[PDB]
């Protein structure tokens, strides 16, 4: 048993954080006050759920989690909602003035006023760990806090916890539900400054989630509540191997070994199926073959891109539910007779399989129907370079005119940082082109 600390930064990181810890509580049988009757070892333990939850002498199971935001209105909802007693109040940190959608304010000027308090509170969590494996960092690309504060935090965690793994869950901007015109700027700045400090990062394209909510869930105009509920289901499927017994991705190090062949190309694509509306309570149950096939349909992807246009370097299939291992084998064999699955010649063409035999949990008040089997596929495909090019093009249109740059320069940032960040993204696009 090796502990994992989750850090949630800014509004997106915090709201997504709230929806994940609610779902984790439901999967492990933990009540909103922290009580867990199925845990025979009171006041301690070495079980798999202990990687995400510590225990007090009173039987209270507390999330190993820190919530930080430069303004207090989003975290105040956590302080007063259903799970207000679950987190330790010193684990929820807020400033007074936000980064105003500006990377430079979150990183340089406003962010500096709270960085040491955040690091000292994370150290209190780390000190209670027997064998800390690392950190899960949740944040948007587009916000001033999600972009700038996250990079300052990632820089400082690399100095103070040098040997520990760092994994991100990052929200990639969408025009349909964005806040600022400068989100492309914030996105490229945070990508450049975090690249060397992160071992693996799962990007969640808000446009992909928005499209799935509309198409599969019949939700006319999806709100953040609908998006976050779907995101938390996918994040739960990715983290299940860390919190339950199993043979695949059992620790943070193994996510790097399985999904990251080279340090810079650390952005795996997640695909999830099936996504069925809760209004279809009596839906037909999809076979292991049908859900497996669904993983190769661009529509079910967490990042909009076409894997038929790229090559695979790794592919992991994580099943949950009534899934017979020989049926997985047969579905994979059928899928291999397909020209759209091209692996790079230097990687084995294998699919790694992990099966958790408990069906997924749905949260009361959610949009999804219950299913007897689900699958999350994690793959490292060069087709995710399409996501990077769309963001780089938006950056280029503005940057050519230097539009909005004075706001960044006025908050202690040099104009040369914009070109150094863009040059790094040009190199990253070439890294994907060199692989294939």
């Amino acid at each position: 048993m090796r502990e994992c600390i989750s850090i949630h930064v800014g509004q997106a990181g915090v709201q997504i954080g709230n929806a994940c810890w609610e779902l984790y509580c439901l999967e492990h049988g933990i009540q909103p006050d922290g009580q867990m009757p199925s845990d025979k070892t009171i006041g301690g333990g070495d079980d798999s759920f202990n990687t995400f939850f510590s225990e007090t002498g009173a039987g209270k199971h507390v999330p190993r989690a820190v919530f930080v935001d430069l303004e207090p209105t989003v975290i105040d909802e956590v302080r007063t909602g259903t799970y207000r007693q679950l987190f330790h109040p010193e684990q929820l940190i807020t400033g007074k003035e936000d980064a105003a959608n500006n990377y430079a304010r979150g990183h340089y000027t406003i962010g500096k006023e709270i960085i040491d308090l955040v690091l000292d509170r994370i150290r209190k969590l780390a000190d209670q760990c027997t064998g800390l494996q690392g950190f899960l960092v949740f944040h948007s690309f587009g916000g001033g806090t999600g972009s700038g504060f996250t990079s300052l935090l990632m820089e400082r965690l690399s100095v103070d916890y040098g040997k520990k793994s760092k994994l991100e869950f990052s929200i990639y901007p969408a025009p349909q539900v964005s806040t600022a015109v400068v989100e492309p700027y914030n996105s490229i700045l945070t990508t450049h400054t975090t690249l060397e400090h992160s071992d693996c990062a799962f990007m969640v394209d808000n446009e992909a989630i928005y499209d799935i909510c509309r198409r599969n869930l019949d939700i006319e105009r999806p709100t953040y509540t609908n998006l976050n509920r779907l995101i938390s289901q996918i994040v739960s499927s990715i983290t299940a191997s860390l919190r339950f017994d199993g043979a695949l991705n059992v620790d943070l190090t193994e996510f790097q070994t399985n999904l990251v062949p080279y340090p810079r190309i650390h952005f795996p694509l997640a695909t999830y199926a099936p996504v069925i509306s809760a209004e279809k309570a009596y839906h037909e149950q999809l076979s292991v073959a049908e859900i497996t096939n669904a993983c190769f349909e661009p529509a079910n992807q967490m990042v909009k891109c076409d894997p038929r246009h790229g090559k695979y370097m790794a592919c992991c299939l994580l099943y949950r539910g009534d899934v017979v291992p020989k049926d997985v084998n047969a579905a994979i064999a059928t899928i291999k007779t397909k020209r759209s699955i091209q692996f790079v010649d230097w990687c084995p063409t294998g699919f790694k399989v992990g099966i958790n035999y408990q069906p997924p949990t749905v949260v009361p008040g959610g949009d999804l129907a219950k299913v007897q089997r689900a699958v999350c596929m994690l793959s490292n495909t060069t087709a995710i370079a399409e996501a990077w090019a769309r963001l780089d093009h938006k950056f280029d249109l503005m940057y050519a005119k230097r539009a909005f740059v004075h706001w960044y320069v006025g908050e202690g940032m040099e104009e040369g940082e914009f070109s150094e960040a863009r040059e790094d993204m040009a190199a990253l696009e070439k890294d994907y082109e060199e692989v294939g």
């Binding site: 105003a100 600022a180 539009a403 909005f404 706001w407």
Partner: protein
């Protein structure tokens, strides 16, 4: 980012300022005595942005009232919301400025400037987290223009990290035919380009044109013009005053609306246009983008939108609003710059204004605003070329080079708008 300190300077500044307090107090359920009579809890959610909480749960406007002419104070108090203002927040001199920018900025105005700053300091230190300032003034007179800009520079030196926002009224010979107004306005624009983060351009030419050609009032008064101004000021402050999904503040509006530091002059717009004592989403989107609904006398179809913010108020389908907003960007695509992606932002507020079931407020940063600047520039040059009435300014200590410099800055501003209007995304 919470409290706003509002300052109102000179006759135009105080009259438009008083109408603003009256209109937003009505929306928030506040009466002239300062008591809360509202029915929706959404009226007090962000009440502290513009109001101070006082003993007895009384709501006092965070407003400072300033004028070199004393009689102005009497007209403010005799209004419906006259006694709601803090009696100590009235800083009024004895000798006015007689339409002289130099009097407001250098001599009579400079004597009463340390007094106003004492009142600003008191209201600012009593704030949990000061967002910045809001100034209402005209550019054509002497106090609101000359002393107003001096106050702005002084505040800017003491509170550099806070936002300075103005509601600046531009002159027109159609409302006031006082030939020194282009001098006063040009001198003030020269200060506004440097010292404010965002300025709402409220043109008396456009206000008169709306009342006369659209509203059929053959003899418009200040009351009539100020009815369009109060609806505009109510609409552009909706998101600072009502919760909404967005947690909007003066700095987030600046970062997103202003791509180049000097281009911070906004062209506001309103729909529907209505007169005193006297609609669907597709119509409201259309009207909000029509030149006849703009509060600056400029045709938006002569330029290009750098950035736009639109606020739809009332009960309506947000999907319908999203649909119509994307539709107006498709057919009118050649009027938006293609090098600033996603440059149109929309908010929906449940609470509509008084008398209207639905409304839309437009805030555009358009290169067409150069038309307003060129109109004033041409008038300044006609006067300045003949050195008419120049001694009224130089006799107060002003150097003739300040006129040359102001004219030079305003023409440079027009060239900068033209530059981004002709730029291509290639």
């Amino acid at each position: 980012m919470r409290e706003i300190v509002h300052i109102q300077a000179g006759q135009c500044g105080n009259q438009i300022g008083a109408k603003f307090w009256e209109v937003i107090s009505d929306e928030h359920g506040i009466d002239p005595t300062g008591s809360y009579h509202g029915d929706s809890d959404l009226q007090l959610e962000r009440i502290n942005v513009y109001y101070n909480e006082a003993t007895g749960n009384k709501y006092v406007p965070r407003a400072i009232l300033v004028d070199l002419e004393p009689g102005t104070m009497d007209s403010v108090r005799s209004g419906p919301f006259g006694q709601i203002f803090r009696p100590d927040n009235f800083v009024f001199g004895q000798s006015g400025a007689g339409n002289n920018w130099a009097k407001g900025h250098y001599t009579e105005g400079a004597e009463l400037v340390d007094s106003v700053l004492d009142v600003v300091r008191k209201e600012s230190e009593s704030c949990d987290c000061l967002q910045g300032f809001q100034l209402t003034h005209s550019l054509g007179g002497g106090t609101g223009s000359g002393m107003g800009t001096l106050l702005i520079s002084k505040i800017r030196e003491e509170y550099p990290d806070r936002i300075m926002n103005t509601f600046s009224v531009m002159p027109s010979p159609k409302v006031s035919d006082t030939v020194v107004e282009p001098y006063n306005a040009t001198l003030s624009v020269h200060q506004l380009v440097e010292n404010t983060d965002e300025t709402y351009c409220i043109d008396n030419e456009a206000l008169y044109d709306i009342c006369f050609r659209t509203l059929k009032l053959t003899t418009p008064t200040y009351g009539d013009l100020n009815h369009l101004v109060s609806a505009t000021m109510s609409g552009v402050t909706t998101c600072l005053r009502f919760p909404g999904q967005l947690n909007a503040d003066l700095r987030k509006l600046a970062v997103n609306m202003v791509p180049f530091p000097r281009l911070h002059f906004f062209m506001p717009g309103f729909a529907p246009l209505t007169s005193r004592g006297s609609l669907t989403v597709p119509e409201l989107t259309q009207q909000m983008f029509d030149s006849k609904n703009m509060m600056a006398a400029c045709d938006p179809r002569h330029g290009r939108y750098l950035t736009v913010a639109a606020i739809f108020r009332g009960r309506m389908s947000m999907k319908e609003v999203d649909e119509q907003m994307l539709n107006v960007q498709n057919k009118n695509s050649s009027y938006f710059v293609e090098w600033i992606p996603n440059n149109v932002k929309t908010a929906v507020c449940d609470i509509p204004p008084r008398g209207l079931k639905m409304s839309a407020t437009f805030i555009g940063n358009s290169t067409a605003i150069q038309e307003l600047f060129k109109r004033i520039s041409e008038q300044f040059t006609a006067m300045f070329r003949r050195k008419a009435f120049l001694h009224w300014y130089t006799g107060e200590g002003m150097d003739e080079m300040e006129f040359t410099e102001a004219e030079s800055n305003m023409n440079d501003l027009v060239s900068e708008y033209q530059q981004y209007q002709d730029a291509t995304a290639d």
